[PDB]
Design a protein around this ligand. Structure first.
Ligand SMILES: O=c1cc(O)ccn1Cc1ccc(Cl)cc1
Length: 133
């Protein structure tokens, strides 16, 4: 039952500072424009120890499967090749991406009936709110 509160199909309902987060990460202009327009759904499922997070939008579809605490290689929507580790720390999914000596962290947390995603690069934080589909 690891992560039951996260499992299901979620749809983006609001975003703040995501363009600025992408700038901080190094995402180029045309990718930022199209990625920032997206209204993705996030589909989270668990099978045994394997968690799968799929993100579907008109921009890109991504899918990652992983075991908590076990590093994996990820190709992000913006085409960075990163080394990622996802852990569950005090009920929060914490997703760290490492590439080119840089690091960014994406946190996913349940708050009321929402799933709140906080993306942090250096001093820039973006908050994205998802609701059940
Ligand atoms: O998967 C997600 C979902 C979000 O709501 C926010 C960030 N990311 C990762 C992401 C990173 C870069 C780009 Cl361009 C798009 C999405």
């Amino acid at each position: 039952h690891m992560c039951d509160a996260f499992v299901g199909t979620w749809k983006l309902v609001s975003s703040e500072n995501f363009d600025d987060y992408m700038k901080e990460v190094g995402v180029g202009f045309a990718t930022r424009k199209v990625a920032g327009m997206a209204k993705p759904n996030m589909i989270i499922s668990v099978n045994g120890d394997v968690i799968t997070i799929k993100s579907e939008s008109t921009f890109k579809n991504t899918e990652i499967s992983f075991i908590l605490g076990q590093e994996f290689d990820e190709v992000t929507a913006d085409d960075r090749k990163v080394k990622s580790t996802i852990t569950l720390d005090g009920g929060v999914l914490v997703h760290v991406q490492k590439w080119d000596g840089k690091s960014t962290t994406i946190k996913r947390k349940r708050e009321d009936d929402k799933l709140v995603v906080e993306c942090v690069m250096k001093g820039v934080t973006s908050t994205r709110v998802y609701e059940r589909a």
